[PDB]
């Protein structure tokens, strides 16, 4: 089958760059195309198993109330005169057409359902050029409320129960740290590799989809749960009609839809499920996965400089044949902190016992270009004081980023205001002032102490800095100094903010 197809209909809107929607034309070549897949005894042998496991699991629909409740805020409105703060406030309107979508599912497990197109917002920085945005298809408010009532509690229950510790979503930073260099320790001679699929959502067939679905089926579920789980496949998992802001049928989909509930899910399954098949292909040893979606990492005991280099070869054939190739081929690894997934790695430092401390960290270049972006414009995400919050004990993170904020806040009289921030697919009103408690609550204490950090990491973020136009360290040192101060001047919780988040700078 065919990734996806067009009528020619455009896709509309509705150093740092943004993409836009006038990069769409390429993201659309590149995610079309035919999708080989062949299977065998061990990808079958695996799903076997996912599925025992899955069959220990019951799980139960959410009421429409429920399903109402946790759709989130700043969620696009429906084509039927309703926000998703009507959804969130139980309005008449908004509960009487969920309920007949709901109806309609049960009753017609067939009719495709239509799904809006759209290119992203999201900023990049540049490379060596011009990364397209990727295009996000989701179907109306009303359908996103039913797959809530239909699978929140499968989605939210089942993966970590299938795949285990495997299953990457259930950690903070310092949990996934711990979990990566536990399985590295645990390797006589540890070999380890990051895979990433060269535009997943494409490469899932509607095999993949039946399979998943499949999946879902052996939980305990409710009667009229199986229904609209089929339904919901059928209608919309596997394909469905596609159109553009200004309601132009832009063509159809026969692949995932980035843009609906069972993705996050379905991906991660779909992922493991394939690289634990291709893992016995490869013949690796003591295997151990991790996996966020298409992004994962494989931790087994080496088998020698040149054996490792071979099965890792055999590794990709085998995703290949399930569909899946690298974007960049894999690479074996000696070194953990060397292995990039999610766009981040493990490293070191020290607290201030001496004791050495593991931590997630990353190339610095994005999150400081959506920072320089989002300096000059307000944002809905403010990526900003995510990468502060998720990335706290990065010193990039602490030198960097903490530190120019709190600069421009106290410059601009703002350290009271609450700003909107979203990270782990939730939207926050984050105020500022509270930082502490939850980088104590993230990553506890030991986040304010560390120091003397790996001679690479610090390398890098010196690198980048010189790259970007951005000062280096020294002047941060300085800089912090003087805004750690005009805090601890201001008392009561200002210097809380100082004591704790800028520790670092005095001498
Ligand atoms: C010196 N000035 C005339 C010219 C600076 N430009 C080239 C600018 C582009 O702005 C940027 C673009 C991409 C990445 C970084 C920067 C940048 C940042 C970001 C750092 C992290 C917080 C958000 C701002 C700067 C912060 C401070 C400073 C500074 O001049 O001290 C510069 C920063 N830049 C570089
Ligand atoms: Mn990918
Ligand atoms: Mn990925």
């Given at each position: 089958?065919?990734?996806?197809?067009?009528?020619?209909?455009?896709?509309?809107?509705?150093?740092?760059?943004?993409?836009?929607?006038?990069?769409?034309?390429?993201?659309?070549?590149?995610?079309?195309?035919?999708?080989?897949?062949?299977?065998?005894?061990?990808?079958?042998?695996?799903?076997?198993?996912?599925?025992?496991?899955?069959?220990?699991?019951?799980?139960?629909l959410?009421s429409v109330?429920?399903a109402?409740?946790?759709?989130?805020?700043?969620?696009?409105?429906?084509?039927?005169?309703?926000?998703?703060?009507?959804?969130?406030?139980?309005?008449?309107?908004?509960?009487?057409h969920i309920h007949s979508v709901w109806k309609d599912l049960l009753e017609?497990?067939?009719?495709?359902?239509?799904?809006?197109?759209?290119?992203?917002?999201?900023?990049?920085?540049?490379?060596?050029?011009?990364?397209?945005?990727?295009?996000?298809?989701?179907?109306?408010?009303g359908v996103?409320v039913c797959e809530?009532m239909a699978?929140?509690?499968?989605?939210?229950?089942?993966?970590?129960?299938?795949?285990?510790?495997?299953?990457?979503?259930?950690?903070?930073?310092?949990?996934?740290?711990?979990?990566?260099?536990?399985?590295?320790?645990?390797?006589?001679?540890?070999?380890?590799?990051?895979?990433?699929?060269?535009?997943?959502?494409?490469?899932?067939?509607?095999?993949?989809?039946?399979?998943?679905?499949?999946?879902?089926?052996?939980?305990?579920?409710?009667?009229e749960?199986?229904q609209a789980?089929?339904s919901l496949?059928?209608?919309?998992?596997?394909?469905?009609?596609?159109?553009?802001?200004?309601?132009?049928?832009?063509?159809?989909?026969?692949?995932?839809?980035?843009?609906?509930?069972?993705?996050?899910?379905?991906?991660?399954?779909?992922?493991?499920?394939?690289?634990?098949?291709?893992?016995?292909?490869?013949?690796?040893?003591?295997?151990?996965?991790?996996?966020?979606?298409?992004?994962?990492?494989?931790?087994?005991?080496?088998?020698?400089?040149?054996?490792?280099?071979?099965?890792?070869?055999?590794?990709?054939?085998?995703?290949?044949?399930?569909?899946?190739?690298?974007?960049?081929?894999?690479?074996?690894?000696?070194?953990?902190?060397?292995?990039?997934?999610?766009?981040?790695?493990?490293?070191?430092?020290?607290?201030?016992?001496?004791?050495?401390?593991?931590?997630?960290?990353?190339?610095?270049?994005?999150?400081?270009?959506?920072?320089?972006?989002?300096?000059?414009?307000?944002?809905?995400?403010?990526?900003?004081?995510?990468?502060?919050?998720?990335?706290?004990?990065?010193?990039?993170?602490?030198?960097?980023?903490?530190?120019?904020?709190?600069?421009?806040?106290?410059?601009?009289?703002?350290?009271?205001?609450?700003?909107?921030?979203?990270?782990?697919?939730?939207?926050?009103?984050?105020?500022?002032?509270?930082?502490?408690?939850?980088?104590?609550?993230?990553?506890?204490?030991?986040?304010?102490?560390?120091?003397?950090?790996?001679?690479?990491?610090?390398?890098?973020?010196?690198?980048?800095?010189?790259?970007?136009?951005?000062?280096?360290?020294?002047?941060?040192?300085?800089?912090?100094?003087?805004?750690?101060?005009?805090?601890?001047?201001?008392?009561?919780?200002?210097?809380?903010?100082?004591?704790?988040?800028?520790?670092?700078?005095?001498?």
């Open positions: 089958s065919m990734s996806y197809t067009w009528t020619g209909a455009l896709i509309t809107p509705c150093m740092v760059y943004a993409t836009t929607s006038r990069s769409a034309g390429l993201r659309q070549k590149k995610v079309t195309f035919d999708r080989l897949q062949v299977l065998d005894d061990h990808y079958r042998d695996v799903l076997k198993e996912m599925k025992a496991k899955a069959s220990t699991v019951k799980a139960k959410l109330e429920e109402c409740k946790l759709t989130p805020p700043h969620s696009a409105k429906s084509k039927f005169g309703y926000g998703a703060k009507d959804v969130r406030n139980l309005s008449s309107k908004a509960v009487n017609d497990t067939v009719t495709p359902i239509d799904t809006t197109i759209m290119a992203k917002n999201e900023v990049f920085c540049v490379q060596p050029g011009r990364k397209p945005a990727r295009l996000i298809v989701f179907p109306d408010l996103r809530k699978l929140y509690d499968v989605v939210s229950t089942l993966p970590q129960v299938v795949m285990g510790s495997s299953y990457g979503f259930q950690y903070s930073p310092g949990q996934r740290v711990e979990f990566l260099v536990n399985t590295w320790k645990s390797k006589k001679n540890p070999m380890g590799f990051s895979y990433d699929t060269r535009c997943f959502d494409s490469t899932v067939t509607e095999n993949d989809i039946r399979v998943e679905e499949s999946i879902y089926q052996c939980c305990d579920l409710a009667p749960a199986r789980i089929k496949t059928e209608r919309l998992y596997i394909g469905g009609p596609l159109t553009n802001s200004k309601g132009q049928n832009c063509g159809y989909r026969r692949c995932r839809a980035s843009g609906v509930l069972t993705t996050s899910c379905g991906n991660t399954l779909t992922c493991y499920l394939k690289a634990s098949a291709a893992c016995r292909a490869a013949k690796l040893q003591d295997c151990t996965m991790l996996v966020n979606g298409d992004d994962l990492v494989v931790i087994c005991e080496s088998a020698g400089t040149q054996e490792d280099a071979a099965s890792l070869r055999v590794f990709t054939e085998a995703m290949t044949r399930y569909s899946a190739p690298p974007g960049d081929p894999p690479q074996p690894e000696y070194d953990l902190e060397l292995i990039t997934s999610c766009s981040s790695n493990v490293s070191v430092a020290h607290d201030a016992s001496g004791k050495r401390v593991y931590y997630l960290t990353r190339d610095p270049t994005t999150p400081l270009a959506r920072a320089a972006w989002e300096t000059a414009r307000h944002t809905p995400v403010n990526s900003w004081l995510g990468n502060i919050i998720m990335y706290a004990p990065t010193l990039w993170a602490r030198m960097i980023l903490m530190t120019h904020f709190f600069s421009i806040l106290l410059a601009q009289e703002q350290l009271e205001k609450a700003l909107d921030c979203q990270i782990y697919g939730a939207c926050y009103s984050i105020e500022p002032l509270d930082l502490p408690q939850i980088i104590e609550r993230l990553h506890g204490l030991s986040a304010f102490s560390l120091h003397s950090y790996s001679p690479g990491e610090i390398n890098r973020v010196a690198s980048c800095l010189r790259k970007l136009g951005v000062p280096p360290l020294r002047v941060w040192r300085h800089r912090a100094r003087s805004v750690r101060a005009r805090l601890l001047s201001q008392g009561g919780r200002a210097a809380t903010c100082g004591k704790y988040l800028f520790n670092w700078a005095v001498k």
